[PDB]
A paper describes a structure:
Proper cell division at the mid-site of gram-negative bacteria reflects critical regulation by the min system (MinC, MinD and MinE) of the cytokinetic Z ring, which is a polymer composed of FtsZ subunits. MinC and MinD act together to inhibit aberrantly positioned Z-ring formation. MinC consists of two domains: an N-terminal domain (MinCNTD), which interacts with FtsZ and inhibits FtsZ polymerization, and a C-terminal domain (MinCCTD), which interacts with MinD and inhibits the bundling of FtsZ filaments. MinC is a critical regulator of FtsZ polymerization that is bound to MinD and oscillates from one polar region within the cell to the other.
We targeted E. coli MinC (EcoMinC) for a structural study and determined the crystal structure of the dimeric EcoMinCNTD at 2.3 Å resolution. We observed EcoMinCNTD as a dimer within the asymmetric unit. EcoMinCNTD forms a dimer via domain swapping between the first β strands in each subunit, as observed in the StyMinCNTD structure. Dimerization of TmaMinC is mediated solely by the MinCCTD domain; MinCNTD is not involved in dimerization in this species. By contrast, TmaMinC lacks the corresponding Gly and Ser residues and hydrophobic residues that stabilize the domain swapped β1–β1 interaction. To generate monomeric EcoMinCNTD, this antiparallel β1–β1 interaction should be broken and the hydrophobic residues will become exposed, because the long β1 strand cannot fold back to make the β-hairpin structure, as observed in the structure of TmaMinCNTD. Thus we see dimeric EcoMinCNTD in the result of size-exclusion chromatography, in a broad range of protein concentrations, as well as in the EcoMinCNTD crystal structure. By using unfused-EcoMinCNTD, we observed that EcoMinCNTD forms a stable dimer in solution and in the crystal, enabling us to conclude that EcoMinC dimerizes through both EcoMinCCTD and Eco­MinCNTD. Taken together, the results of our structural study of EcoMinCNTD reveal that domain swapped dimerization is a likely mode of interaction with polymeric FtsZ.
Author numbering:
A (entry chain A), B (entry chain B): 4 to 101
The structure:
């Protein structure tokens, strides 16, 4: 009675990563935020990694994204075993699309 | 090309909180997680507070929920600017719920 568990859809902003170096991502997110500063400043985002080939230093990637003001709520599209196992270690949840 | 930002829909676990004491909520959550551990461990959750009432210690509730391993990524169905205000302090986003 105290809780109920449900499954519901939420639209979230997704950052689809295509290059891997944190600094390049930081610069690119900066430019993107400037396209709608009032909405994208401090926006909660999900990091999608489906299109990544090179390995990603996650702690460093998490800091580079966070430094732009964006707030990382988790990671999606992670279709690797180890890699998945990695992300979940720093308290970051894995999210899946509907 | 290094980045894309677009909205996507995500099917999420929503814990609907009802009238109660952080210890009780922590109790109820552990019992749910135990029934489906393979799926529920470190799951991302949204906390729906629409059924809560005037007095509620948000810091105590968030700590209790997080203690179960669940990863609170946002709050939904909020009903006052007070509680709301207390939520964005810790940087938790507010979500709208399908």
């Amino acid at each position: 009675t105290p809780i109920e568990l449900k499954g519901s859809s939420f639209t979230l902003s997704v950052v689809h990563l295509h290059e891997a170096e944190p600094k390049v991502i930081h610069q690119a997110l900066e430019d993107k935020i400037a396209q709608a500063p009032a909405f994208l400043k401090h926006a909660p985002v999900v990091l999608n990694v489906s299109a990544l080939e090179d390995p990603v230093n996650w702690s460093a990637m998490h800091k580079a994204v966070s430094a732009t003001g964006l707030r990382v709520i988790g990671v999606s599209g992670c279709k690797d075993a180890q890699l998945k196992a990695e992300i979940e270690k720093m308290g970051l949840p894995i999210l899946t699309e509907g």
